[PDB]
């Protein structure tokens, strides 16, 4: 069962988006379907619901008249169609399946997010954060990428393409005093495995189309 | 209109000791068909929410019987017998007896783990950041408990005050630590004015206060 | 959720 939501990013106030949620693994037309929002740091906050039957919808009390929840079957897909956004609409917005046979709301996508402001986008420039020395009494080296000033969220980071995963931090963003973000992520490695072993962070920044593969060598 | 007050909004819990959490409505979830819908989710650490609980006391799919929940009208209890690292995040209640759906407002669990004293490492700005006219330095405090760690940072023994942000990770699900990044931003000229670079760290793992530090010119 | 009931 994957609930797949695209279509979020950066909007100016008053202005629109459209929201999709790609279903699969469930037989998608017996099931009724909401969207459920979390602005960052905060709470969850039901916003639409609709039935499996007759295209019936409901609203919460805060988008009546500007967001309108639609599906496709034959796609196996659920639209939220966005318009009039505010500021207060700042939220990761997930896809959520709910399961009559137990009464409740089971699956929840993943969430795409949508930022409302009237702040550009911007890029992020990634900077590598280099294994020195030693840096360890105990063999372990820490190296990593500081990726900085970017609008908006979010920013993915793997390593090696997803290859290396273990001891691996990518750290929640800092908003600065600007209204840019930055972020870093880091890995400790075998202080022995520098010599030969290659790193790179793989940063993405989709709201500015930015793709970057950033290769972290010592000294 | 149905308000769901949880208690308490944090909870630190030993692991192998019980947990609890309070969940009452303003209104009874009795409905009129003889079932109570109240549910449980849980938000993992950089995850998306999933269910734990439905209709009051129903363990949904392949979640452990050392959870349980009980209650009943407006008032209800999520137990877990022997709390493991892996229970730590933010935990939900929510209703589906009323239209519309309210969620409380989120309880999040801590792992009171042994303390564990954070591994040291400062990053000097790359010359690729240098070139484009502004300087960061990195201050990275890996795998530590408790949360509470103060990180000063010092230039030529001068305590510096409005030029640095830090992050901090979520308490890992696994070895239930957290992580800390701290970033001092100058410009060029500012950071090449000086020679010494220091992140003191105050932590009660440490056994005396930790610098870690490095020259400017071969940084 | 009771949308989807009633």
Known sequence: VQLLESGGGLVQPGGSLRLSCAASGFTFSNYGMSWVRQAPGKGLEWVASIRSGGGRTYYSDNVKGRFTISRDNAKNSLYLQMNSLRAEDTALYYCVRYDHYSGSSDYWGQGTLVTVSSASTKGPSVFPLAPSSKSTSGGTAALGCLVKDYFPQPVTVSWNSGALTSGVHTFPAVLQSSGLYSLSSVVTVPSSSLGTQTYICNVNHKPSNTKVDKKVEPK | ?219 | ?6
């Open chain 3, 1 to 6: 959720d009771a949308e989807f009931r009633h």
């Open chain 2, 1 to 219: 209109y149905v308000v769901m007050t949880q208690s308490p909004l944090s909870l630190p819990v030993t692991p192998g000791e019980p947990a609890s959490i309070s969940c009452k409505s303003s209104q009874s979830l009795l409905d009129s068909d003889g079932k109570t819908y109240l549910n449980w989710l849980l938000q993992k650490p950089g995850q998306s929410p999933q269910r734990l609980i439905y209709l009051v006391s129903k363990l949904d799919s392949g979640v452990p019987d050392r959870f349980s929940g009980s209650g009943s009208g407006t008032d209800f209890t999520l137990k877990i017998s022997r709390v493991e690292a892996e229970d730590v995040g933010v935990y939900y209640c929510w209703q589906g007896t009323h239209f519309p759906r309210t969620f409380g407002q989120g309880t999040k669990v801590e792992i009171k783990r042994t303390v564990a004293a954070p591994s040291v490492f400062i990053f000097p700005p790359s010359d690729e950041q240098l070139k484009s006219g502004t300087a960061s330095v990195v201050c990275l405090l890996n795998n530590f408990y408790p949360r509470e760690a103060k990180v000063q940072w010092k230039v030529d023994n001068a305590l510096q005050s409005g030029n640095s942000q830090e992050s901090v990770t979520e308490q890992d699900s696994k070895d239930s630590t957290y992580s800390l990044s701290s970033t001092l931003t100058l410009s060029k000229a500012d950071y090449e004015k000086h020679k010494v670079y220091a992140c003191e760290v105050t932590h009660q793992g440490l056994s005396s206060p930790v610098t870690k530090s490095f020259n400017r010119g071969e940084c």
